[model samples]
Target chain A: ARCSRKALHVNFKDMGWDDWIIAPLEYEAFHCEGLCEFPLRSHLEPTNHAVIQTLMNSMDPESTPPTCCVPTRLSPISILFIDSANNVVYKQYEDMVVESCGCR
Target chain B: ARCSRKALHVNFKDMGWDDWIIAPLEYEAFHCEGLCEFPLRSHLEPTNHAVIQTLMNSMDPESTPPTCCVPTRLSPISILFIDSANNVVYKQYEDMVVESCGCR
Candidate 1:
């Protein structure tokens, strides 16, 4: 696993988040911050937004090229594990596209 | 003009970050947190990693689609000028994929 060596840590304060390396084989979640999932696309130019729309339209992680997801739900998240200390270990859930509105 | 209405806010504490909406058309940086880029790939399974690798390899934002980035340099970041309030206004700079190693 990537976290075997233990040479780093992550901190996401606004989200009330942090990480811990109890041992080479142990990990913990240290956060409770949150983000909005579907705010609005107000800042994106038409062309830039088109790029995001394309990614959002596709959402099957099983396909050769998975689609990026703009999740409709935004909640608090934490990083529980890291592969070798650098690669964030994300569960195979829908990749949440945080919109910048609501939940405020 | 997504921010035309004032009803949201963002907070990233670990990175020493925060935001303030002075008016319907203005924003302030209120923070200075940072992160490391390019830590390791130990946690990612071969299959899941393939998805990230594909995104990292393509880095041109001028075409129909833009490639996700895993930059070698990790520095402090802030969110300024959101289009409305739901959309995070990211500068057209390369999207930094933070590696969970180094600068520890």
Candidate 2:
């Protein structure tokens, strides 16, 4: 629906997950409802965290983390998602993590 | 005095510094009676550890750590130094650190 790299917007029910998930676009919003408007970029480095790898490998869209903050290492933008009645739904954060990145 | 890249040999007084010091040859042998045999390599990545950098910055050969094992991240060779009569004085290990790498 968009060109030239459209950021995917996901709704978090206003507070289900952390505010920011600065991860790869290929990373699905396990706990989010998101849609891709543009093709993903090739240069975005795959995350170095082992936890993210395991979650992604499972291959289920609905399968998500208990808390999200998968890509706080990389800088990302913020956006807000609204519902049909124009009520504030989810607000994304720029670079925040809800829990441990699980590097250890 | 050798060519084609001779590895530097340092004596740990038979046992002072850790067994193997897998670091750039430029890295002074603090608690070591070390001598360079051939020119150091240009491509060895400067270590990413902060403690190693600080030690190297302080340019006093005699000044050394209580225990040594700086470049265990990168694999290095083991060598033994001998006394005047060729008695084994020190033995080096490959990829071993005496203490924390100080990445944190």
Candidate 3:
């Protein structure tokens, strides 16, 4: 399969962070997974360097490294957590959720 | 014009970094420019959040922020510079060059 975005729900409680986090047991953070093959497609969002690298990999597999799937767009998430002072605090964490994915 | 990639050459000498850097005096570090409007296109690589935000912006201009042009793919650049120890060093700086751009 080509590089793309996949759904991934992250649970703070699952990671033993429930004590710190107060609201929203889980959130969809999303993830990037799959292979970056030659003949990159438009949706894969290949860069000039990626195109060259992919071509080089196709010509000599060991000479160049293949591109990996990664987040193309990210969004912030609002969180309600307990600060060190033991008070509930509401804050926005930057780049906490992957909004889109691409091969790079 | 719609969001797209634009050529931009970064000169170390112009930035007053020529004393530390050696080799190529400048590099082509492309930039993203232009406006992101309604009717997002495939090349724009709009995320679900961006789509919603754009729709909201169209409906109520003051209610939401419009998406901006940003780098979708980045590539590293090999640098030859003098380290603080007074030794010439050759290293690769990750994400030093923007290879592709998109609206986010």
Candidate 4:
């Protein structure tokens, strides 16, 4: 596939569980047929909100809130992932749990 | 002021620019007193949305959208910084450009 120190830019909203499903080139698409087909339109609910919220709260001085606009979260591209095997990965938003129950 | 690999969890919405203003341990306490003091409540507007939006759009097939919750952003605890010297670090949330007027 690919070789270089370049980075992959990704939008959090439009992509699907398969696009961001970062497995090996071959495994990336593995069992990606039925990714979280439940809870239709479940992309904006609140699941990990508490954990993130809690983490934010625990900040001793609290890392400074961004200074300009409608506060959005920024994380490195590493923390995002989807294990087609375990059938789960955290959503960029916080809802729509996609289950990776495909071609195992 | 401290050392360890444990992550410093932070809430993107509530943190002030100084809270996350990364500087020398000694300088960390610098003018953090006047961090983005003008925007008073200017913490959640909208600036870097387009860059991230475009990058995400460029995904070949599109990265799989996150699963399990309302769409949210997750980046490593990095890429978030505020240079009290040069006076600019990209916000973790994509808005609010904090200025560095601290005792330089």
Best by lDDT: 3
Per-residue C-alpha lDDT of model 4 across residues B42-100, encoded as one tens digit per residue = 22221232223223334432552211111122222224465757755754332112122
Judging by TM-score, tell me the better candidate of 1 and 2.
Answer: 2
Scored by CA lDDT, what does every candidate get?
Answer: 0.25, 0.26, 0.67, 0.27
Q: Which regions of candidate 1 are displaced past 4 Å?
A: A1-92, A96-104, B1-66, B70-104
Lowest lDDT sum, 10 consecutive residues, model 3 chain A, at A48-57
Q: What's model 2's lDDT at B6?
A: 19
Show model 2 residue runs off by greater than 4 Å: A1-104, B1-10, B14-72, B80-92, B96-102
- Candidate 3: TM-score of chain A is 0.86
Estimated TM-score for each candidate: 0.15, 0.17, 0.50, 0.15
After superposition, which runs of candidate 4 have C-alpha atoms over 4 Å from their true positions? Answer: A1-81, A91-104, B1-51, B54-104
Q: Model 3: runs farther than 4 Å from truth?
A: A1-104
In model 4, the Cα lDDT at residue B10 comes to 34
The two-chain DockQ for each candidate, comma-separated, is 0.03, 0.02, 0.03, 0.03
Docking class of 1: incorrect
Task: Evaluate model 3: give its lDDT.
Answer: 0.67
The per-residue C-alpha lDDT of model 1 at residue A38 equals 31
**10 residues in a row with least lDDT, candidate 2 chain B:** B29-38
Query: Model 4: which docking level applies?
Result: incorrect
Quality of candidate 2's docking, in CAPRI categories? incorrect
User: In candidate 3, how many Å is residue B63 off?
Assistant: 1.8
Least accurate stretch of 10 residues (summed lDDT) in model 1 chain B? B1-10
Per-residue error for A84 in candidate 3, Å, reads 49
Looking at model 3, how many pairs of residues clash? Answer: 0
Q: Candidate 1's residue-wise lDDT over A1-104, tens digit each?
A: 11011111222232223353212232221111122123323432112222322233243223212112211222333334456566666543222222221111
